[PDB]
């Protein structure tokens, strides 16, 4: 009639991905955490573009949509910024947005590769991932001699449910019960299937015996970040986001219980 | 190329032809759908005389 006492054991931590294991928790909590990593973790991304000149072979919507998908470093800034819906300013203020600028013209005969390096931001904390001091720069558009691309973009705070550009993950390898002990799957020919990296069984065996009193535990994870948020910041921001959603829901709930009379 | 935005069509008291005061033909002219003979036969089987009357007289060319 109460909560569980989950534990954590990290098996790999890098700047690109983090591999951890959660034990003593329900499958629902593990799946919701997985869903939050993709859809309810705030991040900064371009959401407003004003093309002042574009003589390239790619139309404006093609460039705007491209720019939106460029990841921006948002480790400590996303917690400080606010959503445009709640902000009491107008236009695009510094507290609810980050202004960007691009001014490129191909004067030489060689093809000019407009890259993310050319995106100049007003805040040094929010910059393209590739620009952060190996990895090459993201390619926006190629220009021919005489062509021009000049715009003024604005980044905003958002999450995955609004658009995939606001997804900080590049893959979430969620796995549980590597050896099919709970028999949640039924392999018609278990000998024809490969072994998971987290499996603990001899090669002579195909799957663990069935466990009737078994429950889903020891959920494995691999959160590969796009680069914007460090792999650990995604998990912390996720748990904090889901806990905020439940806190707000509890508030609205109490307001409805009290409103009854 | 068969998208839904190029196929979605609706009409409610739009333009009509000149020879017969019946709805136009085509999305480009805000035309109406054709309540063909096969439809008349179907509603005859249903015994729906009021619907068949509203469609062939009151909703087309009163």
């Amino acid at each position: 009639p109460y909560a569980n006492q989950p534990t954590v054991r990290i098996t790999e931590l890098t700047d690109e991905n983090v591999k951890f294991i959660i034990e003593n928790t329900d499958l629902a909590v593990a799946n919701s955490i997985r869903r939050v990593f993709i859809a309810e973790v705030p991040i900064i991304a371009i959401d407003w573009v004003q093309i002042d000149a574009n003589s390239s072979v790619l139309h404006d919507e093609f460039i705007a949509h491209r720019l939106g998908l460029i990841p921006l470093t948002s480790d400590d800034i996303v917690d400080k910024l606010q959503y445009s819906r709640d902000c009491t300013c107008e236009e695009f203020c510094p507290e609810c947005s980050v202004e960007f600028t691009l001014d490129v013209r191909c004067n030489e005969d060689q093809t000019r590769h407009v890259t993310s390096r050319d995106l100049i931001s007003n805040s040094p904390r929010v910059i393209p991932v590739t620009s952060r001091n190996e990895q090459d720069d993201i390619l926006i558009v190629k220009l021919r001699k005489g062509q021009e691309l000049r715009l003024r973009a604005y980044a905003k705070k958002g999450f995955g449910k609004e658009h995939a550009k606001w997804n900080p993950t590049a893959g979430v390898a969620f796995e549980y019960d590597p050896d099919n002990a709970l028999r949640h799957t039924v392999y018609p020919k278990p000998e024809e299937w490969p072994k998971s990296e987290y499996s603990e069984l001899d090669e002579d065996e195909s799957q663990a015996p069935y466990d009737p009193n078994g429950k889903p535990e020891r959920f494995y994870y691999n959160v590969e970040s796009c680069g914007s948020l460090r792999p650990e910041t995604i998990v912390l921001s996720a748990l904090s986001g889901l806990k905020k959603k439940l806190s707000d829901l509890q508030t609205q709930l109490s307001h409805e219980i009290q409103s009854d009379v | 190329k068969h998208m839904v935005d190029d196929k979605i069509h609706s009409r409610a008291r739009g333009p009509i032809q000149i020879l017969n005061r019946q709805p136009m033909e085509g999305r480009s002219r805000d035309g109406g759908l054709r309540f063909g003979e096969m439809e008349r036969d179907c509603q005859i089987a249903h015994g729906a005389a009021q619907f068949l009357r509203e469609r062939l007289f009151e909703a087309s060319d009163p």
Binding site: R183, V186, Y210, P212 | -
Partner: protein, 148 residues
Amino acid sequence: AGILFEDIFDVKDIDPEGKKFDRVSRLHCESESFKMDLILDVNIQIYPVDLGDKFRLVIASTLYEDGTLDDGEYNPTDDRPSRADQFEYVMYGKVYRIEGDETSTEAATRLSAYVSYGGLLMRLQGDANNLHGFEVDSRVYLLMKKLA
């Protein structure tokens, strides 16, 4: 008490027509105290049964040791004294057919009661003296316990 039949059976064969399902098996059993043949389908996945095993079967109309009818609803929050605690395998079904060898004039000497536990079928056939409490469209239980 609420018991309609009770006896000790011995598994004589398992799936003679071949294994049709994976998590279910048909058991052909025979008793010794009353000599009643039995065909039962059980979930071997959670309650495995091997050939030659011996179990005690108790067909009861209610789980309460005291005479009290059930409401047919799942209420796990019930602390009343239940006879399911003394057994391992328990099922819930209804009698859907009662055959026999009766003729146009003579009564039934041998009977054959069929029960369906939500698809798991059971046929218990033998002498009529042991099958008087069985009636069609009646909810009953199984109370199966394996013994040595």
